[PDB]
A paper describes a structure:
[name] binds microbial pathogens, and lower [name] expression levels correlate with colorectal cancer, but the physiological function of the protein is poorly understood.
Here, we describe crystal structures and biochemical studies showing that the CXXC motif is on a flexible tail, where it contributes little to structure or stability but is available to engage in redox reactions. [name] crystal structures also draw attention to a nonproline cis peptide bond that can isomerize within the protein and to the mobility of glycine‐rich loops in the glycan‐binding site. An understanding of the properties of the [name] CXXC motif and the discovery of internal conformational switches extend existing knowledge relating to the glycan‐binding activity of the protein.
Numbering used by the authors: 22 to 162
């Protein structure tokens, strides 16, 4: 009734990953994004207290952000072409958490149903992030 999906943004390269089985650990509380001049290289997401497996490669610099207590992502925009290139996570505390350089084809993802937040991500990866998708749902009870 409340879940929705935005995606997939990127190419068909790489291999699928999904954090759907990480939801049970809790809401998103932190993000790691490995970045270079051209690409989103890797991703890791913290669900409650539990970091997901890392996906992607190592040819970039690791950027990390903890969300403030009770803060959630409510919109994600970005850029891609043959791989993912840029991500901006917009939060319900007004923060715009940006990773990567402005180049490529844009996407702009918002949740379909009322009062939902980013609950987990999925996508495709190898040595880079080939594609990403955003999964929205209610903030967990
Ligand atoms: Cl590209």
């Amino acid at each position: 009734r409340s879940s929705s999906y935005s995606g997939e943004y990127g190419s068909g390269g790489g291999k699928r990953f999904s954090h759907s089985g990480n939801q049970l650990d809790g809401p998103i509380t932190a993000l790691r994004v490995r970045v270079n001049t051209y690409y989103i290289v890797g991703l890791q997401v913290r669900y409650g207290k539990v970091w997901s497996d890392y996906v992607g490669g190592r040819n970039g610099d690791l950027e990390e952000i903890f969300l403030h207590p009770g803060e959630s992502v409510i919109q994600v925009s970005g850029k891609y072409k043959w791989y993912l290139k840029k991500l901006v996570f917009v939060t319900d505390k007004g923060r715009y958490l940006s990773f990567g350089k402005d180049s490529g084809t844009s996407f702009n993802a918002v949740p379909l149903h009322p009062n939902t937040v980013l609950r987990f991500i999925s996508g495709r990866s190898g040595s880079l992030i080939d594609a990403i998708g955003l999964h929205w749902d209610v903030y967990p009870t």
